[PDB]
């Protein structure tokens, strides 16, 4: 499947533009909660990659954040989390380069002010025929770097539509 080109699904973009004051405050609270959730989630995935390397936990973490991001329309985060899930389940063996995924952005402008590697963490896991999990862990590490960028881009977008720094 292909990563969506828009950061926010148009369903949710319509709601944002149409919401009254009560619904807008409520949705803003949801987003603030999601931001704290995703930062906890990413840091738990990083600690796994650096420590126990439990693929089952990495899968559960991606499953959890796919749902919370998708419910807010943040479909690119959701797509990457789905890759992490399926890599953790050993059902995928591929994760696209950052240049390919950035190139799919429908709005070429949200990149140019940003260091897209700023939130990267070095991938220290080696391919090893004695560790059947090594390849999946390396691809999850790549996907986590993509996630952190998609997360920063989603925050920049949401900040524009809610007129405050989220």
UniProtKB/Swiss-Prot annotation:
Documented effect of changing residue 73 to C: In NH1; causes resistance to the antifungal antibiotic pradimicin
Mutation effect (residue 66 to A): Reduces binding of the 4-aspartylphosphate of SLN1
Q: Name one GO molecular function term.
A: histidine phosphotransfer kinase activity
A Gene Ontology CC term for this entry? Answer: nucleus
Report any Pfam family annotated for this entry: Hpt
State its location(s).
Cytoplasm; Nucleus
Question: Record's PROSITE patterns?
Answer: HPT (PS50894)
Q: Does the keyword Phosphoprotein apply?
A: yes
Q: Which GO terms describe its biological process?
A: osmosensory signaling via phosphorelay pathway; phosphorelay signal transduction system
What family does this belong to? Belongs to the YPD1 family.
> Know the name of this protein?
Phosphorelay intermediate protein YPD1
The scientific name of the source species is Saccharomyces cerevisiae (strain ATCC 204508 / S288c)
């Amino acid at each position: 499947s292909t990563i969506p080109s828009e950061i926010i699904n148009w369903t949710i973009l319509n709601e944002i533009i149409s919401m009254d004051d009560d619904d807008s405050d409520f949705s803003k609270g949801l987003i603030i909660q999601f931001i704290d959730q995703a930062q906890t989630t990413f840091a738990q995935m990083q600690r796994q990659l650096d420590g126990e390397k439990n693929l089952t936990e990495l899968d559960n973490l991606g499953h959890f954040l796919k749902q919370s991001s998708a419910a807010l329309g943040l479909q690119r985060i959701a797509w990457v989390c789905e890759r992490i899930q399926n890599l953790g389940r050993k059902m995928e063996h591929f994760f696209p380069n950052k240049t390919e995924l950035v190139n799919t952005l429908s709005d070429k402008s949200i990149i140019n002010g940003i260091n897209i590697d700023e939130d990267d963490e070095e991938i220290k896991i080696q391919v090893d025929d004695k560790d059947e999990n090594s390849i999946y862990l390396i691809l999850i590490a790549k996907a986590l770097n993509q996630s952190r960028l998609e997360f920063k881009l989603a925050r920049i977008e949401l900040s524009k539509y809610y007129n405050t720094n989220l």
